[PDB]
Amino acid sequence: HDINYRGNRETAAKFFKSKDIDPADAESYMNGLDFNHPVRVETLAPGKNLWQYQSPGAPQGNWYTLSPRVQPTELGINPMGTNRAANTIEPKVLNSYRTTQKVEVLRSTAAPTDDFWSGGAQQLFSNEKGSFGLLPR
Amino acid sequence: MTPIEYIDRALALVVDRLARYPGYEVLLSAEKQLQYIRSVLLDRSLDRSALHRLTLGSIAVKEFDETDPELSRALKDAYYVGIRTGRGLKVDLP
Secondary structure, three states: OOHHHHHHHHHHHHHHHHOOOOHHHHHHHHHOEOOOOOOEEEEEOOOOEEEEEEOOOOOOOOEEEOOOOOOOHHHOOOOEEEEOOOOEEEEOEEEEEEEOOOEEEEEEEEOOOOOOOOOOOEEEEOOOHHHEEEOOO | OOHHHHHHHHHHHHHHHHHHOOOOHHHHHHHHHHHHHHHHHHOOOOOOHHHHHOOHHHHHHHHOOOOOHHHHHHHHHHHHHHHHHHOOOOOOOO
């Protein structure tokens, strides 16, 4: 891989380490990013609207999209999730969040889902859940 | 666990979850990827190019980090087995 790809990998590795993810697990988080596209750290101010797909009945996650128009496949996720109480496969729910505090995020392009084992969208990562407030749906 | 035990642990959990959610594409993909890793662990003569096309780590964190932490853990560890194998490094898991 080229000097840009290696730099994007190092940006992500440093970010995940700083957010209490250990080095072996950090590889999996990095597997969600396409290092052929820019990876940068940004600080969001309070008041930024974001969106997040989740399985029905699931708590808040760590991955956000910048627009509600972005569909799951381009984000590297399946459009169907798991309703655990019902034992069913049902569509992912799109929830809205708004930053409540300044927060650093890792900005990248998803590795999107293709048919090999069967373009990517931009994404944000932050595991500082309390900095993103759930909005009414 | 040995590296094969980490892969068979992940396969056991994926099969259990497929009984809960039959046909679920995320789990069918994870199964195929785990079987691929298993094959290259057991036979060093097989082509290893597809190790760098694994998505198991992404599946663990984007699909299961909240809904199924037990599965997410097993898939993170299996993905790590895969990429350390692909990179020619010791699988330094306990």
